[PDB]
mmCIF file of C-alpha atoms in Angstrom:
data_model
loop_
_atom_site.group_PDB
_atom_site.id
_atom_site.type_symbol
_atom_site.label_atom_id
_atom_site.label_comp_id
_atom_site.label_asym_id
_atom_site.label_seq_id
_atom_site.Cartn_x
_atom_site.Cartn_y
_atom_site.Cartn_z
ATOM 1 C CA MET A 1 3.814 25.535 57.669
ATOM 2 C CA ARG A 2 5.406 22.944 55.379
ATOM 3 C CA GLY A 3 6.475 21.069 58.495
ATOM 4 C CA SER A 4 5.591 17.510 59.477
ATOM 5 C CA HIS A 5 3.161 15.842 57.071
ATOM 6 C CA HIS A 6 2.745 12.193 58.063
ATOM 7 C CA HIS A 7 -0.436 12.197 60.146
ATOM 8 C CA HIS A 8 -4.160 11.732 59.525
ATOM 9 C CA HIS A 9 -5.277 14.833 61.426
ATOM 10 C CA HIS A 10 -3.028 16.322 64.108
ATOM 11 C CA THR A 11 0.107 18.269 63.157
ATOM 12 C CA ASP A 12 1.356 19.689 66.459
ATOM 13 C CA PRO A 13 4.891 21.153 66.120
ATOM 14 C CA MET A 14 4.574 22.135 69.782
ATOM 15 C CA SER A 15 5.234 18.481 70.622
ATOM 16 C CA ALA A 16 8.819 19.094 69.489
ATOM 17 C CA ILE A 17 9.633 21.917 71.912
ATOM 18 C CA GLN A 18 12.121 20.742 74.539
ATOM 19 C CA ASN A 19 14.302 23.860 74.564
ATOM 20 C CA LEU A 20 16.745 22.772 71.858
ATOM 21 C CA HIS A 21 20.032 24.602 71.218
ATOM 22 C CA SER A 22 20.374 26.865 74.259
ATOM 23 C CA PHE A 23 24.146 27.301 74.461
ATOM 24 C CA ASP A 24 26.720 28.260 71.829
ATOM 25 C CA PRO A 25 29.246 31.155 72.012
ATOM 26 C CA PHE A 26 29.170 31.116 68.209
ATOM 27 C CA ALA A 27 25.383 30.853 67.964
ATOM 28 C CA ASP A 28 22.722 32.675 69.983
ATOM 29 C CA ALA A 29 25.052 33.915 72.722
ATOM 30 C CA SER A 30 27.430 36.701 73.742
ATOM 31 C CA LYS A 31 29.677 37.254 76.761
ATOM 32 C CA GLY A 32 32.566 39.633 77.368
ATOM 33 C CA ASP A 33 35.615 38.332 79.220
ATOM 34 C CA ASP A 34 36.211 41.879 80.461
ATOM 35 C CA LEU A 35 32.710 43.349 80.245
ATOM 36 C CA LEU A 36 30.670 41.698 83.000
ATOM 37 C CA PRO A 37 26.974 42.228 83.899
ATOM 38 C CA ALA A 38 27.654 43.883 87.257
ATOM 39 C CA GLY A 39 29.758 43.561 90.393
ATOM 40 C CA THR A 40 27.290 41.583 92.492
ATOM 41 C CA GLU A 41 29.481 38.575 93.312
ATOM 42 C CA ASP A 42 26.264 36.548 93.057
ATOM 43 C CA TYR A 43 25.106 37.296 96.600
ATOM 44 C CA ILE A 44 22.348 35.363 98.371
ATOM 45 C CA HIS A 45 19.265 37.546 98.804
ATOM 46 C CA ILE A 46 17.233 36.659 101.901
ATOM 47 C CA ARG A 47 13.958 38.661 102.260
ATOM 48 C CA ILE A 48 11.197 38.095 104.811
ATOM 49 C CA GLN A 49 7.421 37.962 104.298
ATOM 50 C CA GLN A 50 5.219 38.514 107.358
ATOM 51 C CA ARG A 51 1.603 38.176 106.217
ATOM 52 C CA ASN A 52 0.128 38.941 109.633
ATOM 53 C CA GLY A 53 1.766 40.146 112.845
ATOM 54 C CA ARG A 54 3.942 37.036 113.076
ATOM 55 C CA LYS A 55 3.244 34.861 110.020
ATOM 56 C CA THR A 56 6.789 35.434 108.763
ATOM 57 C CA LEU A 57 8.407 33.407 105.984
ATOM 58 C CA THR A 58 12.119 34.122 105.495
ATOM 59 C CA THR A 59 13.125 33.111 101.964
ATOM 60 C CA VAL A 60 16.529 32.528 100.372
ATOM 61 C CA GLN A 61 17.333 33.613 96.819
ATOM 62 C CA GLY A 62 20.597 33.080 94.974
ATOM 63 C CA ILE A 63 21.301 29.615 96.336
ATOM 64 C CA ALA A 64 22.210 26.962 93.767
ATOM 65 C CA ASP A 65 19.574 24.343 92.980
ATOM 66 C CA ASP A 66 22.442 21.840 92.992
ATOM 67 C CA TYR A 67 22.611 22.191 96.779
ATOM 68 C CA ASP A 68 21.358 19.282 98.881
ATOM 69 C CA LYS A 69 17.704 20.371 99.037
ATOM 70 C CA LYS A 70 17.293 17.833 101.839
ATOM 71 C CA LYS A 71 20.320 18.686 103.980
ATOM 72 C CA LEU A 72 19.640 22.304 103.005
ATOM 73 C CA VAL A 73 16.286 22.934 104.694
ATOM 74 C CA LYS A 74 15.980 19.670 106.644
ATOM 75 C CA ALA A 75 19.114 20.670 108.545
ATOM 76 C CA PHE A 76 17.412 23.964 109.384
ATOM 77 C CA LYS A 77 14.726 22.145 111.369
ATOM 78 C CA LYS A 78 17.552 20.300 113.139
ATOM 79 C CA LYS A 79 19.575 23.387 114.079
ATOM 80 C CA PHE A 80 16.903 25.951 114.972
ATOM 81 C CA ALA A 81 13.874 23.635 114.907
ATOM 82 C CA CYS A 82 11.963 25.901 112.526
ATOM 83 C CA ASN A 83 9.618 25.163 109.623
ATOM 84 C CA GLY A 84 11.573 25.290 106.383
ATOM 85 C CA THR A 85 10.380 24.577 102.850
ATOM 86 C CA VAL A 86 11.638 24.830 99.264
ATOM 87 C CA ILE A 87 9.660 26.972 96.815
ATOM 88 C CA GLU A 88 10.415 27.895 93.206
ATOM 89 C CA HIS A 89 9.351 31.543 93.143
ATOM 90 C CA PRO A 90 8.703 32.885 89.600
ATOM 91 C CA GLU A 91 9.893 36.375 90.541
ATOM 92 C CA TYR A 92 13.228 35.087 91.852
ATOM 93 C CA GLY A 93 13.555 31.461 90.794
ATOM 94 C CA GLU A 94 14.174 28.612 93.230
ATOM 95 C CA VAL A 95 14.088 30.080 96.737
ATOM 96 C CA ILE A 96 13.778 28.319 100.092
ATOM 97 C CA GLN A 97 11.007 29.389 102.467
ATOM 98 C CA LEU A 98 11.679 29.386 106.210
ATOM 99 C CA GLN A 99 9.078 30.069 108.894
ATOM 100 C CA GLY A 100 9.325 33.146 111.094
ATOM 101 C CA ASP A 101 11.898 35.935 110.961
ATOM 102 C CA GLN A 102 15.017 33.895 110.220
ATOM 103 C CA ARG A 103 16.823 36.765 108.478
ATOM 104 C CA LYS A 104 19.325 36.455 111.330
ATOM 105 C CA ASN A 105 19.250 32.649 111.536
ATOM 106 C CA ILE A 106 19.247 31.850 107.816
ATOM 107 C CA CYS A 107 22.319 33.966 107.038
ATOM 108 C CA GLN A 108 23.812 32.265 110.074
ATOM 109 C CA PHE A 109 22.658 28.915 108.690
ATOM 110 C CA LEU A 110 24.088 29.517 105.220
ATOM 111 C CA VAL A 111 27.441 30.073 106.913
ATOM 112 C CA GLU A 112 27.000 27.440 109.625
ATOM 113 C CA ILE A 113 26.406 24.709 107.047
ATOM 114 C CA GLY A 114 28.402 26.298 104.245
ATOM 115 C CA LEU A 115 25.506 26.999 101.900
ATOM 116 C CA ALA A 116 26.018 30.632 100.923
ATOM 117 C CA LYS A 117 29.068 32.868 101.336
ATOM 118 C CA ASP A 118 29.799 35.545 103.939
ATOM 119 C CA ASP A 119 30.258 37.894 100.985
ATOM 120 C CA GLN A 120 26.939 36.764 99.516
ATOM 121 C CA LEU A 121 25.163 37.401 102.829
ATOM 122 C CA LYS A 122 22.333 39.516 101.431
ATOM 123 C CA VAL A 123 19.776 39.981 104.208
ATOM 124 C CA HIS A 124 16.801 42.188 103.324
ATOM 125 C CA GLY A 125 14.277 42.220 106.149
ATOM 126 C CA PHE A 126 10.937 43.410 104.774
#
């Protein structure tokens, strides 16, 4: 170890783990100005999840967390009057969860409010 030695009986280096140094083109990083990951244009993947024969939950993946979480979903319940929520899926990462098959309303919402982009319109009905 040879780390911190100023305690009576603890020593927990884990206490100093706040994700330090996580950005540096000249240190732990690599990006090609010409070589890009893939031509995806960062679309907005929808995807529906109908547990039963109606318990649908249209989700939205790709959207930026910077968006107005409130005006984002809250507005949904004001336009279509549907049940919308915000979930941070581990398989996708930060994805809204609408109630019922909104694959046609959400994409319409993303464009109606200006959330996603017509080019990002990635609707994938289960």
